[PDB]
Every structure is written in structure tokens, then in C-alpha cells.
Amino acid sequence: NLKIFKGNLIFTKTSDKFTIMKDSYIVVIDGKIASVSSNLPDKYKGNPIIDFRNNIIIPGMNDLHAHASQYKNLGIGMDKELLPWLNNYTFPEEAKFLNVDYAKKTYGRLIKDLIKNGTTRVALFATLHKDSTIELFNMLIKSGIGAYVGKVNMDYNCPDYLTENYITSLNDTEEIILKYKDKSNIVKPIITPRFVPSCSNELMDGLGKLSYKYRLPVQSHLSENLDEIAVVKSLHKKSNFYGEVYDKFGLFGNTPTLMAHCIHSSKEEINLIKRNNVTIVHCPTSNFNLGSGMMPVRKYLNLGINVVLGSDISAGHTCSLFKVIAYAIQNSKIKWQESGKKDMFLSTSEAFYMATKKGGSFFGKVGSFEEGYDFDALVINDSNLYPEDYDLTERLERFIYLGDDRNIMKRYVCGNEIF
Amino acid sequence: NLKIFKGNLIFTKTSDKFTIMKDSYIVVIDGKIASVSSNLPDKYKGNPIIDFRNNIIIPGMNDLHAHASQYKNLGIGMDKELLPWLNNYTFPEEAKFLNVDYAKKTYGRLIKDLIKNGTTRVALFATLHKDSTIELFNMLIKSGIGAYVGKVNMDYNCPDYLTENYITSLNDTEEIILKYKDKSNIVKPIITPRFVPSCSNELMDGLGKLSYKYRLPVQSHLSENLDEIAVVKSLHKKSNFYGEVYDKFGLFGNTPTLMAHCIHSSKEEINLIKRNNVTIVHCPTSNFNLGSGMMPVRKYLNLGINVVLGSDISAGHTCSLFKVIAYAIQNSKIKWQESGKKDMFLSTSEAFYMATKKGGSFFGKVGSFEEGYDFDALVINDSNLYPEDYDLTERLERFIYLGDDRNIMKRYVCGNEIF
Ligand SMILES: Nc1nc2[nH]cnc2c(=O)[nH]1
Ligand SMILES: Nc1nc2[nH]cnc2c(=O)[nH]1
Ligand SMILES: [Fe+3]
Ligand SMILES: [Fe+3]
Numbered sequence: 001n002l003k004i005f006k007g008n009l010i011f012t013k014t015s016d017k018f019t020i021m022k023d024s025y026i027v028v029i030d031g032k033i034a035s036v037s038s039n040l041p042d043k044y045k046g047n048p049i050i051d052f053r054n055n056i057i058i059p060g061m062n063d064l065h066a067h068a069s070q071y072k073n074l075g076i077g078m079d080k081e082l083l084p085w086l087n088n089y090t091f092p093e094e095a096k097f098l099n100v101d102y103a104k105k106t107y108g109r110l111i112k113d114l115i116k117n118g119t120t121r122v123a124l125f126a127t128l129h130k131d132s133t134i135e136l137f138n139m140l141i142k143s144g145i146g147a148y149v150g151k152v153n154m155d156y157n158c159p160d161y162l163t164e165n166y167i168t169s170l171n172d173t174e175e176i177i178l179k180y181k182d183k184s185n186i187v188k189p190i191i192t193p194r195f196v197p198s199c200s201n202e203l204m205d206g207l208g209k210l211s212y213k214y215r216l217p218v219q220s221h222l223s224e225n226l227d228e229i230a231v232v233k234s235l236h237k238k239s240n241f242y243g244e245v246y247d248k249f250g251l252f253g254n255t256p257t258l259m260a261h262c263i264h265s266s267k268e269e270i271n272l273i274k275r276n277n278v279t280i281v282h283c284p285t286s287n288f289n290l291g292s293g294m295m296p297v298r299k300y301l302n303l304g305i306n307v308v309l310g311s312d313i314s315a316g317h318t319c320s321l322f323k324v325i326a327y328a329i330q331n332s333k334i335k336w337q338e339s340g341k342k343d344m345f346l347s348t349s350e351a352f353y354m355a356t357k358k359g360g361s362f363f364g365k366v367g368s369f370e371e372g373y374d375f376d377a378l379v380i381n382d383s384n385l386y387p388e389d390y391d392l393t394e395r396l397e398r399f400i401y402l403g404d405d406r407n408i409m410k411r412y413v414c415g416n417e418i419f
Numbered sequence: 420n421l422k423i424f425k426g427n428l429i430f431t432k433t434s435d436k437f438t439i440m441k442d443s444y445i446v447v448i449d450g451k452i453a454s455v456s457s458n459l460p461d462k463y464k465g466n467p468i469i470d471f472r473n474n475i476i477i478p479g480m481n482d483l484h485a486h487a488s489q490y491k492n493l494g495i496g497m498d499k500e501l502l503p504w505l506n507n508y509t510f511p512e513e514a515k516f517l518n519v520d521y522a523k524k525t526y527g528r529l530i531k532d533l534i535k536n537g538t539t540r541v542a543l544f545a546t547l548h549k550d551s552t553i554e555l556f557n558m559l560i561k562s563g564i565g566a567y568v569g570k571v572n573m574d575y576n577c578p579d580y581l582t583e584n585y586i587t588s589l590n591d592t593e594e595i596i597l598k599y600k601d602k603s604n605i606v607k608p609i610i611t612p613r614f615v616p617s618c619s620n621e622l623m624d625g626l627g628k629l630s631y632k633y634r635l636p637v638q639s640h641l642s643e644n645l646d647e648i649a650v651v652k653s654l655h656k657k658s659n660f661y662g663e664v665y666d667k668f669g670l671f672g673n674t675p676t677l678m679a680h681c682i683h684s685s686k687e688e689i690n691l692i693k694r695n696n697v698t699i700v701h702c703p704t705s706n707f708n709l710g711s712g713m714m715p716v717r718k719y720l721n722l723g724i725n726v727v728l729g730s731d732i733s734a735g736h737t738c739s740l741f742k743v744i745a746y747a748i749q750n751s752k753i754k755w756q757e758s759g760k761k762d763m764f765l766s767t768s769e770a771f772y773m774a775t776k777k778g779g780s781f782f783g784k785v786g787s788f789e790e791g792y793d794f795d796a797l798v799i800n801d802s803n804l805y806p807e808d809y810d811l812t813e814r815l816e817r818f819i820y821l822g823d824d825r826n827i828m829k830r831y832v833c834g835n836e837i838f
Contacts, residue, residue: 075820076813079766109805291752291764317745317820326736333710337500345710347498386528394495401494401736404823 003028003415004044007052007379009036010396011059011369015353019369020392025049026057028375031414036369052379054387055409056395059367060120060376061321062359065219065260065281065310068124068136068149069094069103071110073314078289082225082315085290087159090314094127094152095162103132104139110319111143116405117320120376120413121146121363123219123258123281123310125192128152128164130172137180140187144418146363146376150192150219151176153207156200166203173207177214186363186414190258195221196245197231208250217256217362220246222280223269224261224292241269243278253278256362260310261286262300263293274305279362282354283312284327290315294331298343301350308359309351322400325351348397379410422447422834423463426471426798428455429815430478430788434772438788439811444468445476447794450834455788471798473806475814478786479539479795479830480740481778484638484679484700484729487543487555487568488513488522490529492733497708501644504709506578509733513546513571514580522551523558529738530562534837536739537827539795540565540782542638542677542700542729544611547571547583549591556599559606563837565782565795569611569638570595572626575619585622589629596633605782605833609677614640615651615664627669636675636781639665641699642688643680644711662688662697672697675781679729680705681719682712689722698725698781701773703746705734716751717762720769727778728770741819744770767816798829 005028009021027035027044035041040049070093077089097103114122124147126133133151140147151173155166177189191211193199199207211218223229223242232242239245243259246252252259253276262273262280273280282295300307309324310316316324329346336345360367366374384407385398399407411418424447428440446453446463454460459468489509496508516522533541543566545552552570559566570592574585583591596608610630612618618626630637642648642661651661658664662684665671671678672695679700681692692699701714719726728743729735735743744767751764779786785793803826804817818826830837 072808075817076809081760285749288749288752291756293756294753330704330707333707334713337710337712341500341710345498389491390495398494406825 001030001415002047004040004047004049005052005057006049007055007057008392009057009369010392012349012353012357013368013370015350015358016347018349018352018393018396022392026369026375028415031374031416033369033371033373033375036371056380056382056392056399058378058380058396059356059360059369060378060411060413061118061355062308062363062367063114063119063122063311063321064258064279064308064359064362065283066122066124066313066319068107068110069097069127070314071106071113075317078317081227082290082292083227085315091159091162097127097129097132100131100135103129103135107136107139111139113319115143115145115411115418116408118378118405118408118411119145119319119321120411120418121360121366123148123190123362125150125152125194125219128154128162128169130176134176134179137187141184144416145413146186146366148188148190148217148219150190152192152194153203154194154198155203156198158198166200166206169203170206170210174210177210177216181214189216191216191218191251193220193251196242197228197235204249204251211255212250215255217258218251219258220251220260222259222262223265224263225290226264229264241266243269243272247272247276252276258362260312261292261295263287263295270300270303270305274303277306279306279308281308281310282328283310283316283324284331285318285324286312286316287331288327289317294334296335296343297328297332297346298335306358307354308362309354320405321355322403325355325400328354348400375412375415377412378408380407381409382407420449420834421466422469423459423466424469424471424476426474426476427811428476428788429811431768431772431776432787432789434769434777435766437768437771437812441811445788445794447834450793452788452790452792452794454790474828475799475801475811475818477797477799477815478775478779478788479797479832480537480774481727481782481786482533482538482541482730482740483677483698483727483778483781484702485541485543485732485738487526487529488516488546489733490525490532494736497736500646500709501711502646504734510578510581516546516548516551519550519554522548522554526555526558530558530564532738534562534564534830535824535827537797537824537830538564538738538740539830539832540779540785542567542609542781543569544638545570547573547581547588549595553595553598556595556606560603563835564832565605565785567607567609567636567638567782569609571611571613572622573613573617574622575617577617585619585625588622589625592626593629596629596635600633608635610635610637610670612639612670614647615661616647616654620668623665623668623670630674631669634674636677637670638677639670639679641678641681642683644709645683648683660685660688662691666691666695671695677781679731680711680714682706682714689719689724693722693724696725698727700727700729701747702729702731702735702743703750704736704743705731706750707746708736709734713750713754715754715762716747716765717754725777726773727781728773739823740774741822744774745819747773767819794831794834796831797827799826800828801826
């Protein structure tokens with residue numbers, strides 16, 4: 001199974017700069033990149049060449065945080081702060097997933113939107129419902145894209161119409177794990193406690209045991225809202241900071257861990273994140289829409305902390321990680337300005353790096369056009385943006401700032417075209 | 420000329436709420452709204468009905484600040500704050516408008532982009548060049564959209580490739596004024612000193628005299644960047660604040676005046692703005708892109724200050740005022756958070772109000788569906804956004820957050836369809 005793609009390649013091997021290869025070739029064998037060069041090796045001559053001409057080829061987007069079950073509230077109900085917000089629109093929407101048919105329907109729309117926007121790998125929070133989450137697993141597997149799917153664990157202080165017993169929660173979680181742990185190579189389970197204020201100690205310890213037992217990655221929320229933070233230290237008077245409680249249960253780095261937002265994290269929480277090698281998911285659109293605050297990304301990057309990007313949909317108003325890239329840069333420009341121009345804002349390559357190679361690394365060797373990497377890619381047709389007047393770097397930047405899904409001509413995950 | 424439109428009408432008579440009229444009629448005579456009602460009067464029973472069915476009809480977008488000559492820099496060169504950005508990217512690009520053909524080509528692309536995005540009235544900054552600006556006037560008159568066009572006055576501390584002397588600057592400005600202060604009814608001239616840092620006392624004085632003589636509106640920039648502000652106090656050592664400099668020369672409210680950004684305005688400047696009935700043009704996208712800062716919109720609205728929106732293109736990355744609306748709201752949410760939640764963020768209706776009825780009032784009776792107003796409108800087809808699941812308010816919000824020009828099916832200016 002060999003495929004050869006030709007076009008203008010743009011990717012980031014490192015965060016400081018773009019690697020640009022005009023009219024170059026990418027040879028894919030069994031879904032993985034075997035060769036990337038400006039000249040087609042003779043050992044591959046005679047093979048069909050999928051020539052994308054003057055179009056741009058870039059790696060796919062890797063969204064490390066999105067709530068699949070909140071798709072319907074996209075662009076709606078953003079007049080309340082995190083906690084109040086959940087109670088008014090989010091919980092009522094997620095509760096609807098008790099019905100598997102509603103789930104099939106909504107997740108169907110979600111998946112088509114993700115692919116349409118060029119998201120090739122995504123870390124998703126589903127709902128506490130087992131059957132609907134199982135349906136999401138199957139639909140994702142059928143779609144061809146990669147993903148970490150997490151049945152949501154929430155048994156504490158939740159609404160009567162959207163709550164669960166920790167005993168059932170754990171049994172359902174483990175049941176899901178056993179069913180999908182070895183099924184697909186790109187759609188896998190991930191331990192997903194919603195967050196401290198929603199999980200009892202019983203639940204968290206049980207989830208911690210599951211993560212260890214099955215060597216599974218973890219995902220959850222961290223220091224997104226001030227009131228949220230006050231609730232955590234209130235329920236847990238023995239903790240000095242938010243992330244400490246997760247760590248107490250073995251859900252803070254023992255295995256690859258994703259922590260969303262991390263806007264108001266204290267110095268200690270930051271050090272722990274660094275120490276335990278936790279990955280921070282920067283969700284700028286969500287931070288703006290919910291009025292959560294503005295994350296100091298340069299400060300975290302200076303400390304060597306792993307930072308990726310997430311759409312955090314519903315809270316975040318868009319599935320396009322390209323739009324998330326723009327907002328991350330814009331958010332960083334304000335941090336730069338407030339710091340007296342000391343904390344350099346993000347360059348286009350740095351944010352693009354987060355979206356591709358860095359985020360992709362959570363899923364495996366994906367996110368860059370280098371030998372051995374899965375071929376997750378997008379073909380960008382920017383013919384409506386006067387491309388003739390700009391170099392390749394400017395064209396990618398303009399696609400990011402001025403373009404949209406209309407410019408995405410093709411999607412590939414592990415060498416397979418996704419429709 | 421009589422025309423009758425039917426569809427779901429959404430507009431804002433006031434900023435606090437939307438007026439929604441499902442399947443209602445708008446009768447237009449000679450370009451102005453004759454009536455707006457759920458039922459069509461018997462008087463027109465024989466007239467054809469332009470039925471837009473389930474589509475949405477909203478007034479056009481009124482962009483109160485954009486640099487027409489910067490169209491080519493959209494999406495690129497945003498890695499520098501104001502001053503160095505001007506010296507390195509903007510001035511060099513504007514210098515090319517010495518060539519009238521480059522101007523016709525570039526301005527042609529601009530106009531198509533504005534119309535495509537639903538901007539029906541726009542306040543534009545051209546370049547200091549007389550011939551190219553005259554061409555812009557002519558092209559806008561041909562296009563059919565409304566606009567205030569301003570040859571840019573800049574004679575102080577400007578590069579050799581982009582400067583003029585105040586005498587010639589004033590002569591060309593008056594030449595243009597006499598040539599267009601009657602020609603078109605919706606495309607008119609506006610006094611345009613670029614801003615204090617590049618305008619001599621002689622120029623500003625001469626411009627204030629022209630403004631008074633021909634009773635013309637004024638448009639400029641105000642307290643957008645800290646270094647810019649520092650330059651003004653340094654050049655005008657006796658001024659108490661930036662805005663005072665413009666007022667000294669009669670360029671601060673004697674006639675309708677537009678002042679863009681107003682991010683770092685002092686308490687005294689703000690009071691002068693309210694006192695002199697000056698209009699603040701909020702340009703959120705630009706403020707993020709150049710790391711200028713974040714404008715405190717609620718603080719100004721609480722003082723009863725006039726506030727409208729501008730794309731500020733090039734600095735701002737998009738001609739879509741719908742995107743600008745989203746950004747203004749998001750920017751306000753962060754200000755709300757930093758104010759301990761005391762200064763409420765903008766509601767969708769408030770920002771929409773700025774873009775329509777308020778911004779429109781600067782051009783005349785435009786921006787709302789009420790008797791007497793010019794019929795500037797857009798027909799939104801949101802069929803790709805699962806409209807069947809949302810009410811009209813939600814549909815509009817979803818168009819603002821998730822939609823784009825592809826949902827803009829038709830646009831009208833003064834009752835005439837614009838292609
Ligand atoms: N962004 C976000 N944070 C959360 N914390 C708990 N629930 C949620 C949710 O649904 N969205
Ligand atoms: N945003 C912005 N501010 C300015 N101040 C002076 N010139 C400019 C310009 O071109 N853009
Ligand atoms: Fe989230
Ligand atoms: Fe400007």
C-alpha cells in the first residue's frame with residue numbers, strides 16, 4: 001500500500017520556524033511517511049502521483065480538548081460564567097444524550113464538522129452515558145479520524161437529571177475500556193473525571209486505579225474559573241492548590257495527562273504540572289467567551305511546560321483549530337503588551353506547532369512531515385485569496401486569518417482520505 | 420419605484436434588545452422604508468412580493484473605520500506594535516498608491532471584499548495621494564455602497580516615499596471636497612488627518628478650517644498605542660492629553676467626528692469625548708493583532724458615549740463586521756472579568772446595535788427597519804447551520820459566531836441590490 005503526494009509542503013519540525021518545500025513529494029507506505037523530498041526518489045518512479053499542483057499541504061489539526069456532547073450549543077448561550085453556564089445550557093444539553101438516537105444524530109453532525117474543519121485527531125469529553133459514548137466510539141472508528149474518547153465521570157454535586165453513582169460509573173468506565181482498549185489503533189479510551197468539584201473521592205480513587213491498571217491517559221479541567229477554584233479548595237480543605245487533589249489520586253501525570261485551560265494556576269500548581277509532565281490545553285476562544293481570563297502562554301513555555309491547543313467546543317465557539325491558532329496568538333499579544341513587551345507573543349509557527357507536531361505527539365508520531373510519522377494531512381486550496389501575490393508562509397497565515405473550511409480540499413488520516 | 424420584501428426580520432431599535440418579526444413585510448419606496456408589519460396592507464395586494472421565506476433579513480453592516488489602501492496586508496505583517504508596524508509594513512504599502520493602476524487593482528479587490536462581507540456603509544482612510552483617492556471615490560460611487568472617503572493628511576515626520584507638505588495637502592483636500600461635496604449622495608468626503616504624530620500644527624489648523632468651512636465630518640486615531648501617546652505628549656508638551664490636541668484645532672466634535680481605538684484614554688479625554696459628542700470607533704480585532712490593548716467599552720457606554728465598530732483592516736484581519744462584533748463581545752467579557760464582574764459585558768444586541776443602527780446613524784437614517792430609513796439590508800441564508808433547531812435570535816448569533824460570507828445571499832443599499 002503505497003501512495004505519493006506532491007505539492008507545496010508546510011510544516012513545523014520545531015516551534016521556531018516553518019519548514020517549506022515547494023513542489024515536493026511525500027511517499028506514504030502503510031499510512032506512515034517513508035520519504036519527504038523535493039525530488040521523487042528513483043525507487044518510487046512508476047507509481048501514481050497525486051499531484052496537488054500549486055495547492056498547500058499541511059499536517060492535520062490536533063484538537064486536544066472538546067466536548068463532543070455540546071455541539072448543539074455552538075455559538076449559543078454564552079451570557080454566563082463557567083459554573084452558572086453549566087447549569088443553564090450545558091448540563092441540560094448533555095442530559096439529552098440519555099437517548100442514544102439523539103446522540104447518534106448530534107455526534108454525527110459533530111464528526112462531520114470536525115472533518116470539515118480539518119481536525120484529524122481529537123481528545124473528546126462525551127457524557128456520563130455509557131451507551132451513547134459507545135456509539136461515539138463506533139462512529140469515530142467508522143469516520144477514519146483519530147481520537148481519545150472519554151465517558152465522563154461525574155457523581156458529586158451534579159443535577160438530578162445528570163448525575164451518576166460512583167459504583168456504576170466505575171463499572172461502566174472499565175466496561176468501556178475492555179471493549180475498546182485493543183479494538184482500534186487510533187480511537188482509544190481516556191480516563192475522564194469531569195473535574196474535582198464533580199467527583200467524589202470514591203470515584204477519583206477508582207479512576208486512578210483504572211488508569212494505572214490499564215495504563216491509560218487522563219483528561220480533565222484545571223483552574224479555568226475563579227469561582228470554580230474557590231469551590232475546589234472549599235471541598236478539599238487539605239489541598240494547597242487545584243492540581244494537588246488530582247495528583248493525590250494518581251490522575252496528574254503518571255500517564256499522559258491533559259489538563260484544560262489552566263488560566264489562574266498558582267506557582268506551585270505550575271511547578272507540579274511541569275514536574276509531573278502534565279500537558280496544558282490552551283483554549284483561548286473558550287477563555288474569551290466565558291470570560292474566564294487570559295492564559296500566560298509564554299510564561300508556561302519559558303518553564304518548558306507542554307502546551308497544546310483545544311477548541312473546547314460550546315464554550316469555545318468553533319471547531320476550527322485554525323481559528324483557535326489565531327485567537328491564541330491574539331491572546332498572547334495582549335499578554336505581551338501587559339508585560340511591557342517582555343513576554344514575546346506567539347509567532348505563527350509556534351501556534352501552528354502546538355496545533356500540529358506538539359498536539360499530535362499525544363496521539364503518537366503525527367503532526368509533522370518526517371519519516372515514520374502517520375500521514376495526517378490537509379490540502380489547502382487558497383485560490384480565492386490572491387495567492388499569486390504572497391509567498392507560502394504568508395499564504396498559510398492568510399488561510400488562518402482570512403480562510404475557512406471552504407479552502408480545505410482534502411483530509412487524510414494515516415494515509416487514508418477522509419470524507 | 421416600489422418594492423416589497425418578506426422574510427424573518429431581526430433588528431435593533433435600541434441596544435438592549437432585538438426586535439424580531441417572523442414572516443413580516445417591508446415596503447420600500449424610492450429606497451426608504453414605507454412600512455414594516457407582520458401583515459401586508461391591502462393597498463399592495465397586486466404588487467409582487469420578494470419572498471425570502473425562512474431566510475433572515477437584517478440591516479447592513481456599517482464599518483466606521485478601515486484603511487482601504489491596506490487591503491493587501493490582511494492576515495500578514497502583524498508582528499509589530501503600531502509605530503514600527505507603520506514604518507515597516509503600512510507606509511511602504513501605502514506608498515505604492517502613487518501608481519493609480521495599483522490603486523485601481525487593489526481598491527477593486529477591497530470593494531468586492533466589503534460587499535461580499537455585507538458592509539453597506541464604510542468610513543475609509545485612503546492614502547495621501549490625490550489621484551488614487553479620487554479613483555476610490557469613483558469606484559465606490561460605481562459600486563453602489565455608501566461611504567465616507569478620506570484622503571490622508573500626513574506631513575510631519577513621515578518617510579520620504581510617503582510625505583507631503585501641508586500647503587499641497589490642504590490644496591488637494593479642498594480640490595477633492597469641491598469635486599464630491601454634491602456629486603454622490605451616499606459617497607462623501609471626510610477630513611482625515613492621519614493622527615497627531617504625523618500632522619503639523621499648520622496642517623491640523625488648516626484641516627479644522629476646512630471642516631468648519633464645508634461643515635464636514637472628521638475622522639482620526641486616538642490613544643491606541645502607549646508609545647504613540649508618549650510621542651504626542653512629547654510633541655505637544657503643553658497638552659494635558661491626546662484628545663486635547665485635536666480639540667485645539669477644531670478637529671474634535673465641532674462636526675460629527677470619528678476617533679478610532681481610544682484604548683488608553685485618560686479620565687479627562689473621556690469626558691471631553693462625551694462633552695464634544697465625539698464618536699469612538701471600537702476596533703477590537705486590530706487591538707488584539709497589534710497588541711495595542713483592550714478598550715473598556717462598558718466604562719464608556721455607562722458615560723453615554725457614542726460607540727461604534729470598525730474593522731480597521733490590515734491591523735484588523737477581517738472585513739467582516741460580524742467577526743468584529745464577536746471580538747468586541749469577547750473583549751468585553753475579559754474586561755468584565757477583570758472588573759470583578761462589575762462592568763457587564765456586551766450582549767449580542769448591544770454589539771449588533773453598534774454595527775447597525777448606531778454606526779448607521781453616522782451616515783444618516785440607516786441601520787434599522789423603521790419608517791423613513793434607507794433600505795440597507797442583508798439576506799442571510801443559514802441553511803448549513805441546522806436552523807430548524809434554533810429560534811431567530813439563536814440563528815443570528817450562530818451566524819455571527821460560526822457563519823461567514825457564504826451565508827450572505829443578498830445585500831441592498833438604499834433599496835438597490837448590490838452585486
Ligand atoms: N470548559 C468547560 N469546563 C468545564 N468544567 C466542567 N464542566 C465543563 C464544561 O462543560 N466545559
Ligand atoms: N490601526 C492603525 N492606527 C494608525 N494610526 C496611524 N496610522 C494607523 C494605521 O494605519 N492603523
Ligand atoms: Fe472544557
Ligand atoms: Fe486604524
